[PDB]
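Re: [help] complex structure
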Amino acid sequence: MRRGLVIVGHGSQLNHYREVMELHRKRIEESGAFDEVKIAFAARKRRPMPDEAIREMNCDIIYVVPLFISYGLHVTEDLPDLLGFPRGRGIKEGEFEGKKVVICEPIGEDYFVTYAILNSVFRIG
Amino acid sequence: GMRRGLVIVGHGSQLNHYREVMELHRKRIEESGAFDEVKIAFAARKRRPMPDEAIREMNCDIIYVVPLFISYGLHVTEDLPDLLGFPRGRGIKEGEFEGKKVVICEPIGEDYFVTYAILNSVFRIG
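Output below.
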């Protein structure tokens, strides 16, 4: 099957943020775990918006991952509104111009982010 | 072996889930034993505790201040160093704050652990 990923970020006035999104895009695309990998933004009218990434992708299922720490306003309101998806917390399985689309949970709670905190001190790799 | 502390510095939210995420990271690292002390603080919209207050509560040689942020944005390059009286800009920053050694570390954004966290929002292992 063809499985898609869209990474949805906040963006920033400073360039580093977009550059970080492109870094994960490239790392994940070159791994081959998904057939298609794109980035999108969910704040400040930043482009691409999630709908623009999704419309370009020809996949049987597309996962949208919020690159955000918590269930806040951007994740529970801005992102769902942008997709026409339900507001609030939790994973959301939906259809979007006849494609299957699942918004995932924010990364914040993951043990890998605990480890990223540790590794900001330990600098392993 | 030196007395090492960690201050995790976050953005916060008008909703509750950010504070609980911060608390969960603090609690995980406290129980792991990796550091002598772990505290949380905030670097947006006058949120509390601020980094200066977390540090003043700490009994350590060195304190590593870790930005819980994706990038070197306005919060990382302006708010966080202003709240510490450190100069603005990119990069790691090491100095002293009222007599204790403080290292502002890099934000977590570029870590391979963030790439894997992205993968695990999909794969949901653990």
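The radius of gyration of chain B is 15 Å.
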